Design a protein around this ligand. Structure first.
Ligand SMILES: [Cu+2]
Ligand SMILES: [Cu+2]
Ligand SMILES: [Cu+2]
Ligand SMILES: [Cu+2]
Length: 476
């Protein structure tokens, strides 16, 4: 049979009341011919792409039609805590909340997803994620590929696993609290190995790693290069040519790739050196989508310069915050042992060479920052507003992968896990790798967040977040 076409999320803008409506609800999807209950925004799975313009405000009306509470967080958007949609941003089942977003950051591809306390991994795994396309005046002048769903296409890549009855098989247990929830089936905008027909010339892909726990590494099947033009928080100063592009959970990159007549190629993900993630079929390069060239000229450009990246400032005298990530040693060792028992040696491929003892020992609060599992009622500190700070994040003490994300900002990486960042990672980021080493970022918060609607800082391996690896902080 033929591959399905890549689903394209609808690109949504405001009505004359300046409103965008998002409904959160459950329905059915089909995977490999089997129905499954899934959740979506404005549909049964995933969500639309909300289009925002710098300097304009929009109001979003969010209707929770699930039977459990949820929240809606705009990952990558710099907005006050009151509208950030972290765990305090509860939307009751059957209720509605509205937020007004005053967009004030450069063009970028951001995304949105639930942030329900202790249940974010399940709610994302069940299907909830959407996209945010921010435009500004600068980016349109570049004449990049811009025809949505033709030569400018979002690519949301996620894994799932399913039970024999076809349902999504999600669990937050001792194993997944240690190594994450991951599966054996790869979805691309919700479809299994789709094709996308693209015109000859440049094709812009807006890549999102929407997995709960799996890191990805994109490349092409015939080794044509990818030209990175943007990271989480917007354009790079100039394109960066790569042969492979690692993408951590929750990160976005935009790339241009050449499309030539008569030569289809796949976007693939290459095996990664992360525990659990190289079990077949992910022990080998895995297709993401087939690009099918069409003999119609594509009009977009790859300009030599994209934007101006400001210099880093002097670091002397800036506030230095320390954030020590940790995992309880026993629950780390127990969850790694369960992984090894289940899958054997392959669960460490590519890596470097039972009684109840009470709530003190519960895995639901085993992961921590600065010795504390996330306490929604106690922000750990009060950060300055409008001031650069250096945040130092350490994963020394365990060897798991922690893509560390800070709400309310786009930062600059100073050190990523003990090395200067790669050139395509040196611009605006909202995530930094922490794995057995130490990272340092330069952050500035332009908006307030009070104790009642605090910003989060957390590992974006969702099962770690949900079992305590998160803190709240206020600004202003
Ligand atoms: Cu996120
Ligand atoms: Cu976020
Ligand atoms: Cu983590
Ligand atoms: Cu978050």
């Amino acid at each position: 049979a033929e591959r399905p076409t890549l689903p394209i999320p609808d690109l949504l803008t405001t009505d004359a009341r300046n409103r965008i409506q998002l409904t959160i609800g459950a329905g059915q999807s089909t995977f490999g011919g089997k129905t499954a209950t899934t959740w979506g925004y404005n549909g049964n799975l995933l969500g639309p792409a909300v289009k925002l313009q710098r300097g304009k405000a929009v109001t979003v009306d969010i209707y929770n039609q699930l039977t459990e509470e949820t929240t809606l967080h705009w990952h990558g958007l710099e907005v006050p805590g009151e509208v950030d949609g972290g765990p305090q941003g509860i939307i009751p089942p059957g209720g509605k909340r509205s937020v007004t977003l005053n967009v004030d950051q450069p063009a970028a591809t951001c995304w949105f997803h639930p942030h329900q306390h202790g249940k974010t991994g399940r709610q994302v795994a069940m299907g909830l994620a959407g996209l945010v396309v921010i435009e500004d005046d600068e980016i349109l002048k570049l004449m990049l590929p811009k025809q949505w769903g033709i030569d400018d296409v979002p690519v949301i890549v996620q894994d799932k696993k399913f039970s024999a009855d076809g349902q999504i098989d999600y669990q937050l247990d001792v194993m997944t609290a240690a190594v994450g929830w991951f599966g054996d089936t790869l979805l691309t905008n919700g479809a299994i190995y789709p094709q996308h027909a693209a015109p000859r010339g440049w094709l812009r892909l807006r890549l999102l790693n929407g997995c709960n726990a799996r890191s990805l590494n994109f490349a092409t099947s015939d080794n044509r290069p990818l030209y990175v033009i943007a990271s989480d928080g917007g354009l790079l100063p100039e394109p960066v040519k790569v042969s492979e592009l690692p993408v951590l959970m929750g990160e976005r990159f935009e790339v241009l790739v050449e499309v030539n007549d008569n030569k289809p190629f796949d976007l693939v993900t290459l095996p990664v050196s992360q525990m659990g993630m190289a079990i077949a079929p992910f022990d080998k390069p895995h297709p993401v989508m087939r690009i099918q060239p069409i003999a119609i000229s594509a009009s977009g450009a790859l300009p030599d310069t994209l934007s101006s990246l400001p210099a880093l400032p002097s670091l002397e005298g800036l506030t230095v915050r320390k954030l020590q990530l940790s995992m309880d040693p026993m629950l780390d060792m127990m969850g790694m042992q369960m992984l090894m028992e289940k899958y054997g040696d392959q669960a460490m491929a590519g890596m470097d060479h039972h009684m109840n003892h009470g709530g003190k020992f519960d895995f639901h609060h085993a992961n921590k920052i600065n010795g504390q599992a996330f306490d929604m009622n106690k922000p750990m500190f009060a950060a300055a507003k409008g001031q650069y700070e250096r945040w130092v994040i350490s994963g020394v003490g365990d060897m798991m992968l922690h893509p560390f994300h800070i709400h309310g900002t786009q930062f600059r990486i100073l050190s990523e896990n003990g090395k200067p960042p790669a050139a395509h990672r040196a611009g605006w980021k909202d995530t930094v790798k922490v794995e057995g080493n130490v990272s340092e970022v330069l952050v500035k918060f332009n908006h307030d967040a009070p104790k009642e609607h605090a910003y989060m800082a957390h590992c974006h391996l969702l099962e770690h977040e949900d079992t305590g690896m998160m803190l709240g902080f206020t600004v202003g």
